[PDB]
Design a binder for this molecule. Structure first.
Ligand SMILES: Nc1ncnc2c1ncn2[C@@H]1O[C@H](COP(=O)(O)OP(=O)(O)O)[C@@H](O)[C@H]1O
Ligand SMILES: Nc1ncnc2c1ncn2[C@@H]1O[C@H](COP(=O)(O)OP(=O)(O)O)[C@@H](O)[C@H]1O
Ligand SMILES: Nc1ncnc2c1ncn2[C@@H]1O[C@H](COP(=O)(O)OP(=O)(O)O)[C@@H](O)[C@H]1O
Lengths: 38, 441, 239, 459, 198, 443, 121
């Protein structure tokens, strides 16, 4: 299985929260906020 | 706040015999009118009769509004009770006829029954996927009771609601699947500490128990007018509240009348006929009355209660005078209830009730003087002096309203009869009907 | 209609051979002798002259010129690409030392720099927020979004069309009656535009930022008069 | 940017600028000359009880009538009531002329003003973080998700205000707002805790020299704390709630946006909305988070209302949430504007007149006129000889109070263009001859307009 | 009719329109109990599907008369409790994917007049915005009425329609005015006027 | 058909000799009124010649004397070739626009612009279509089409393939193509292919194959009124306002441009101007502001002829408090000529009742016709004509083949005439609501 | 006025358009904005077009009938090539009124105001 190239995932549970980003979006402008721009 | 009819809390009649008590539920006297009104309440509560027009007539004061307001208080919440000042029918947005049609149809309720499913549980997990630079959204909710846990798919509308509501793990939430409303109720454990800006701390709750889903019957009452508005439009249902409806086409109302009959026989709806109270009806014109003649003839007509102060008076839009200000072919359709001027023993009781409602402690001498003033100057004026005397008594730090305070109130504030004398005594310094006046000393 | 009227200069606004007036009048009345063009505005921008206020209404000479020439639909799309920043200033520039700061070029935008709505969005218990939402909350609580339609139009039609035996008339029918820019505004970005906006090295704006068609007031009927039978009817329509 | 004007910031003066209050003792008895009033002692004492009625918040929809000739101080008394109450209490003044809208039925206009006159005060807490963004920094998660290139557990933002610096350890979901708002380092933002999102105010003017040209305005750094939590008091009329519900403002769709670009006509709002507003307002009052502030609707020239307006006011005044209504009239025995064969006192229908507390205002004695002249002179800043005070007061007695008061400003100018700071009889005698009163002008119409063929008045 | 099995847009790269790209067609797969088709839809029919919020696995209805689309529900193949929203789970349509239905309709001439005065049936932009604007009566011209007489006359000559002339009852007819009565002198001359009872 | 029997259905024309304009005593449905019908015949000559502009004719006479009948006769004898505008004066009182705008629009509807345009048009039965979709569609395709005289193949351009696939053209369809614009209209289906049409119900009609050349230069003649050109130019789809009717007050500089443009087309020969006629029924319902407008609107070269009808005596002009003949100001009547219509003699009443009985489906005995004629003399022509329908329905209910005296007498007894109904209100006065509003409900 | 012979870009947006008549050819350097006007008209090579080069108006007159047999049927309006000079210079005296200026400055007019087709407001 591989995640959707265009969708960023937020998830929250007992441990708190994470956001996970497709490697297709790292190296785009969307990656910049995660420290992983062009 | 206290208002003119706040003490009126019913019609004051025996529910068995319909006998009016001489004082009850804030109403005093008027026993024939109160008994007639009690019979009209039975016609309303039974609902079988359509379009009976009742006119409460009498001189000013004498409780025509008070009795009509007593009826509203006796019907309770489920039944429609539309009140019109007859001056509201004149409009720029719509014709007078349309304004009357809307007010008639506001007075008929439609009690829809729905069955709905609500979820309720502790949120164990929430997951949301968002597109970059676009509207596409999807997600999953993991939700729990002491006895179930399940994972639900979420659509875009749910994801908007979930974030608007800031749903977080450990929250207790309930979701009406029919309306799509989400509400939070508390938390199963403390708000987690690592993150800043996480918002106000909730109520505590223990986890919900039993099944996640449950079914719930829910009942909604809407007017025929509200159905008219919803069905005349694809878009713009804000007209329910804004006015702004235009003149709704009659073939829409034909369809709604048919479908509501179908909904009733189908058992989807119970029709609930209420009343239109038209206040000071002599403000309607001859075209309004000609419309109402036949609006009354529908089997969806409400019972129409009316009030008039008028004697033999000119009909509006008309050359000629008629009793009550109303035309005769209209009055042929109308039964009249008559209210009468009060006895001093009735005025004393009404003033005592007003004083209690306004929380004012009259001395017996102040009440006697106010009763005498009530005979000479009118019930409304004497009721105004109660509030005035209370203020004056308080400024002199008295415990109770004395004759001193009523006399000073009477001195400061003129009654209508004394004001008319003041006007007659100063006809040159007041402006005349022909506009002449003298400003010089 | 004959093409003489519908195509060959029986229409006053459309220039061509046999309508020598329209091309002149289009240029001179909308640009040369037009008060809203930036060269004309710039002459009147001072003193007590008629565009003196423009310095303070938060709009450029270019924006004043666009708003005078585009229609209220096109302007409403342009208004989608804009931010309520004067309302955000009400949240931030708040203390007495902030002196109710406002950009001087936005000085006359008084009623949006200060109004209660923006504050009610931000307070932790939404009392004034809920008070401003009563009408739509009540509407949905009554279920009028979900109750079946009790009426619909008995007949429905598409718009009347001109029939003219010219190819230009057919082109114009597509340009106006199926107007691409209005449709694109209503329904929003295409799937490749969403990809091209999302995978690029830098952000990029879209002609409308979103689909500008409203949400339908009725949750099940939406924008059509089609109706579908149901089990409730099926059980009850046989005694 | 804007060039501040430094020299002078003095007030203008208008017909009632001298009225400062009702001028009453702590016992409520009127002082014979106080707060700019002279005389009217009974009417001022009655208006003093009206002020106490309003300020007590017990009662709804009581009516008051100020009755008396023109110039007898009725609007002076209304303006004095508004000043005794102070600006926290709503005060909605209209003439009866203002009710005849072209957009809506006149009873809607009356009901709008009726609910403008009712205030609501709501107390809430505002809770936001603010600053220029000093830093933005992800934290990787210790349990990264499979198949994803990065997993972020926290998103740190440094916020700086003029008064401090703070590291906000935010929930990772704020990436959504940062992307959509395009937040950079050096942009001024706030984060609101009721959503956890952020909004961008602009770029900090600390960066206004980053480029020779950039297409954005620059905004100052917030001069508050970096974390602003405080209570805020919001005052709205119930009419503001009507419009906020009947004409929602924030809509993102094409129809909303075309709406706010077009002429925003008022609409004949329903009793169903107003009743539903009233019922929810009363919930919050019972919870104690809001308090109702019943104000005053003052209707000047109330004889301009017609019988349809008055019969509507019957219903309006009976509602539980209603202002105090004050009416003023001077029309003697007069025809009701909408009922061309009914004549009544004050021009008020007798049916409606029974509701009102009536306060009469009487004419002025010559010595009261003279006292008003001096109060008016010292308010307009005119300095008079005592002979000039007498000559002006003589016009106040012989002609009209208003006329004699109006000569003071012409006479002041005529004095100073003779180099005199103090106005004297010579100046009054010229002002009164340049500026005629109504009656002397009417004598000219009677004398010169004896014929109309040429050089005569049109009649 | 059918369950939507696949749904795929295809795009136009407009160079200089200024509105950016547009969608040139949609390919959609509809499956019924009896058979299956793939439809290459016109953009204006895809806009109807966009308004109806259709997704793969929905059951939909497409009236080619109007180009209107109705979403009937989710396919029963997806029937599950575990969605927060109250979906209509519906069975796969019986019969062929493509059908012709015969319906007998009752209309008045006024319903035809109004339908063609304020059009709402097409997927064009005028019809679209006509569904969003406030309802409004208009002074319908005699040109529209005579045109609709010709439309109805063709339905009659085609044999698909029959005329049912009825009656107008004007109660309280004394409340009319001299302009109304003067207008009835024209209106009652009309060769398809009803019977009028006063 | 759709067109039912109405009051005027028997009128087919004016009943006048085309050579001399002598009216025949009865023809084309008009009886008597010979002097008035001759005058109306002279007015038709003025209309058809088009030379004279802005004449106003008043038809003056008592009620039911054939003023509308003569107006229908003129409309029927002009036919469809000329603009005829039928205005009830009550219609000018719009809420959408001012009275003078409504009068301008009525005048502008009554002048036609006549334009002649050719198109090549291709019409035939489809023998075959093939289309190649590759898969985006419409890559290439071929049409085979025939008449009874001719058959051809056409290679199709991709936008014609879009037209063909839009209109779902299939083998056997009989189609016409307006090849100047490429709209294709499916004229029908050929009978020779009936079994190919498996989706068509049994109610489906079928045509024979078309005839002659597959391609013809058809010439179309259009008439468009000046009002249509005005309304077209008012907004982006202004022509829709010709149907919904929400034209505003269209600005006069638009009309002045159009007047110049049409005079240009006339001198270039691109178009011809066809002056029509405006009919204003009950012209006395116009007010003094309408008449002062009409005064000068008649002075234009683009004025129609106007024809007006009035029942009124010396009567109050609307919008003023004084009285004038016909209810019309003398200021206006100076620019008008009057045609006067008289009451009918008994033999004219007999003939009109006969024609009305033959236009209706009514077999009428001679004694019933004599009785109805006497009722006509005593109760008026309209009442007797209304009794024809009634007596037929009574005769039919008793299953009679002819209307007899018995049936007319039932009708006369059941339905009062105006004079009997006036007597009824005078005898019933206390039970009816009087002008003072008084009434007594008691027995 | 001529048959379009060429539509070549010459800028990073400026075209050269070639126009032909029975009496010769001419090439025009196009301003980027009149090019978009020509592009909103559905102009292609072989079409006949009219241009007011001073006012910036242009019209597609049709497709030149030298292309009439591109196909045997197409939904297209074939017109003869212009028989005159491809370029014409005319002196026109144009009248307006101050009210025409009022109207033009008060509201978007004509083809600017497309939403006006909805009527009502
Ligand atoms: N019989 C009664 N019992 C109690 N209160 C009364 C009675 N009659 C009148 N009132 C009160 O006195 C005032 C005047 O009566 P109202 O009903 O307004 O008279 P009207 O018939 O003119 O409407 C109201 O505040 C009402 O509450
Ligand atoms: N008692 C008073 N003391 C001081 N000034 C007064 C007094 N009464 C009236 N005036 C002034 O004289 C003028 C007339 O009073 P105003 O209130 O306008 O009369 P009204 O409202 O009755 O027409 C106003 O300029 C007012 O300020
Ligand atoms: N000379 C005539 N010949 C034939 N029919 C006539 C004649 N005069 C009147 N009628 C018919 O009698 C009826 C009444 O006359 P009409 O012209 O309608 O009345 P008015 O003159 O009041 O308009 C109409 O149905 C009309 O067709």
């Amino acid at each position: 299985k591989r995640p959707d190239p265009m969708m960023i995932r937020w998830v929250n549970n007992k441990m708190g929260s994470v956001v996970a980003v497709p490697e297709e979006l790292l190296g785009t402008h969307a990656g910049v906020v995660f420290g992983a721009g062009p | 706040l206290i208002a003119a009819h706040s003490h009126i809390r019913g019609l004051g009649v025996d529910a068995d015999t319909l006998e009016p008590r001489p004082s009850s539920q804030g109403l005093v006297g008027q026993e024939k009118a109160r008994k007639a009104a009690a019979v009209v309440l039975e016609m309303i509560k039974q609902g079988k009769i359509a379009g009976r027009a009742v006119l409460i007539a009498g001189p000013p004061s004498t409780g025509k509004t008070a009795i009509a307001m007593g009826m509203a208080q006796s019907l309770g919440q489920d039944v429609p009770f539309t009140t019109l000042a007859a001056s509201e029918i004149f409009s720029l947005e719509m014709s007078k006829t349309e304004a009357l049609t809307q007010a008639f149809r506001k007075s008929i309720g439609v009690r829809i029954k729905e069955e709905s499913e609500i979820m309720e549980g502790e949120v164990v997990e929430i997951q949301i996927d968002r597109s970059v630079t676009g509207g596409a959204k999807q997600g999953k909710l993991t939700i729990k009771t002491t006895d179930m846990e399940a994972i639900y798919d979420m659509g875009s509308k749910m994801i908007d609601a979930m974030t608007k509501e800031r749903v977080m793990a450990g929250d207790i939430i309930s979701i009406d699947k029919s309306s799509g409303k989400i509400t939070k109720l508390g938390r199963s454990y403390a708000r987690s500490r690592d993150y800043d800006a996480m918002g106000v701390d909730t109520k505590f709750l223990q986890c919900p128990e039993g099944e996640l889903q449950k079914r719930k019957e829910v009942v909604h009452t809407v007017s025929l007018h509200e159905i008219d508005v919803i069905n005349s439009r694809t878009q713009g249902f804000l007209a329910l509240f804004s006015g702004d409806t235009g003149e709704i086409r009659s073939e829409i109302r034909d369809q709604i009348n048919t479908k509501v009959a179908e909904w009733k026989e189908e058992g989807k709806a119970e029709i609930v006929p209420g009343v239109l109270f038209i206040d000071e009806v002599h403000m309607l014109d001859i075209e309004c009355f000609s419309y109402i003649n036949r609006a009354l003839e529908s089997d969806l007509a409400p019972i129409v209660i009316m009030a008039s102060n008028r004697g033999v008076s000119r009909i509006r839009g008309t050359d000629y005078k008629s009793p009550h200000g109303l035309p005769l072919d209209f009055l042929d359709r109308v039964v009249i209830i008559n209210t009468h001027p009060y006895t001093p023993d009735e005025l004393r009781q009404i003033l005592s009730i007003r004083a209690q409602e306004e929380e004012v402690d009259l001395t017996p001498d102040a009440l006697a003087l106010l009763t005498k003033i009530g005979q000479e100057a009118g019930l409304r004026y004497a009721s105004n002096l109660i509030t005035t005397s209370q203020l004056i008594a308080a400024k002199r730090r008295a415990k109770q309203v004395g004759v001193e305070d009523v006399q000073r109130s009477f001195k400061l504030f003129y009654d209508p009869a004394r004001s008319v004398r003041f006007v007659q005594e100063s006809e040159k310094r007041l402006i005349g009907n022909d506009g002449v006046v003298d400003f010089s000393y | 209609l004959p093409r003489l009227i519908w195509c060959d200069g029986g229409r006053l606004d459309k220039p061509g051979p046999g309508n020598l007036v329209a091309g002149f009048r289009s240029k001179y009345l909308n640009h040369m002798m037009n008060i809203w063009t930036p060269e004309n505005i710039r002459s009147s921008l001072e003193g007590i002259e008629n565009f003196t206020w423009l310095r303070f209404v938060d709009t450029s000479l270019q924006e004043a010129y666009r708003a005078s020439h585009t229609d209220v639909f096109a302007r409403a799309v342009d208004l989608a690409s804009k931010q309520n920043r004067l309302g955000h200033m009400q949240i931030v520039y708040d203390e007495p030392e902030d002196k109710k700061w406002t950009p001087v070029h936005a000085l006359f935008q008084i009623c949006e720099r200060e109004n209660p709505k923006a504050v009610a969005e931000i307070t932790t218990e939404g009392v004034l927020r809920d008070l401003m939402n009563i009408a739509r909350v009540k509407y949905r609580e009554l279920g009028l979004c979900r109750l079946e339609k009790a009426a619909r139009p008995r007949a429905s039609a598409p718009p009347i069309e001109v029939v003219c035996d010219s190819r230009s008339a057919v082109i114009e029918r597509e340009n106006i009656m199926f107007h691409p820019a209005m449709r694109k505004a209503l329904f929003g970005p295409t799937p490749s535009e969403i990809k091209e906006a999302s995978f690029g090295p830098r952000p990029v704006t879209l002609y409308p930022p979103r689909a500008l068609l409203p949400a339908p007031d009725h949750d099940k009927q939406r924008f059509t008069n089609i109706t579908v039978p149901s089990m409730a009817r099926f059980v009850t329509d046989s005694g | 940017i804007s060039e501040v004007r430094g020299n002078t910031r003095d007030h203008r003066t208008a017909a009632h600028t001298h009225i400062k209050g009702l001028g009453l003792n702590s016992s409520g008895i009127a002082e014979k000359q106080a707060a700019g009033f002279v005389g009217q002692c009974a009417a001022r004492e009655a208006c003093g009880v009206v002020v106490d009625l309003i300020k007590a918040h017990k009662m709804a929809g009581r009516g008051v009538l100020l009755a008396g000739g023109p110039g007898t101080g009725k609007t002076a008394l209304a303006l004095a009531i508004s000043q005794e109450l102070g600006t926290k209490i709503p005060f909605c003044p209209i003439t009866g002329s203002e009710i005849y809208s072209t957009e809506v039925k006149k009873t809607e206009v009356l009901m709008e003003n009726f609910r403008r006159a009712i205030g609501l005060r709501v107390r809430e807490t505002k809770d936001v973080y603010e600053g220029e963004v000093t830093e933005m920094t992800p934290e990787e998660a210790e349990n990264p998700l499979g198949g994803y290139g990065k997993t972020i557990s926290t998103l740190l933002i440094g916020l700086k205000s003029a008064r401090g610096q703070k590291k906000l350890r935010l929930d990772p979901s704020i990436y959504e707002a940062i992307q959509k708002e395009r937040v950079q380092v050096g942009d001024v933002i706030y984060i609101e805790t009721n959503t956890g999102a952020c909004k961008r105010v602009g770029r900090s003017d600390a960066y206004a020299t980053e480029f020779d040209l950039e297409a954005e305005e620059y905004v100052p750094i917030p001069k508050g704390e970096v974390h602003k939590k405080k209570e805020i008091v919001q005052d709205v009329t119930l009419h503001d709630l009507d419009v906020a519900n009947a004409r929602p403002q924030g809509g993102q769709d094409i129809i909303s946006m075309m709406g706010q670009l077009m002429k925003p006509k008022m609409t004949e709002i329903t009793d169903k909305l107003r009743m539903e507003i009233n019922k929810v307002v009363q919930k919050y009052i019972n919870q104690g988070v809001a308090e109702l502030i019943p104000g005053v609707l003052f209707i000047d020239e109330a004889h301009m209302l017609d019988i349809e307006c008055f019969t509507y006011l019957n219903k309006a005044l009976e509602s539980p949430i209603a202002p105090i209504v004050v009416l003023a009239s001077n029309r003697g025995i007069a025809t009701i504007r909408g009922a061309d064969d009914l004549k009544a006192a004050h021009g008020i229908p007798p049916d409606f007149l029974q509701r009102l507390l009536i306060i009469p205002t009487h004419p002025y004695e010559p010595d009261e006129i003279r006292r008003i002249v001096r109060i008016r002179a010292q308010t307009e800043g005119v300095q008079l000889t005592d002979a000039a005070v007498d000559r002006v007061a003589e016009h106040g007695v012989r002609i009209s109070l208003r006329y004699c008061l109006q000569l003071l400003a012409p006479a002041s100018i005529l004095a100073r263009v003779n180099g005199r700071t103090q106005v004297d009889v010579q100046d009054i005698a010229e002002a009164e001859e340049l500026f005629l009163d109504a009656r002397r002008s009417a004598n000219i119409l009677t004398s010169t307009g004896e014929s109309g063929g040429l050089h005569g008045f049109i009649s």
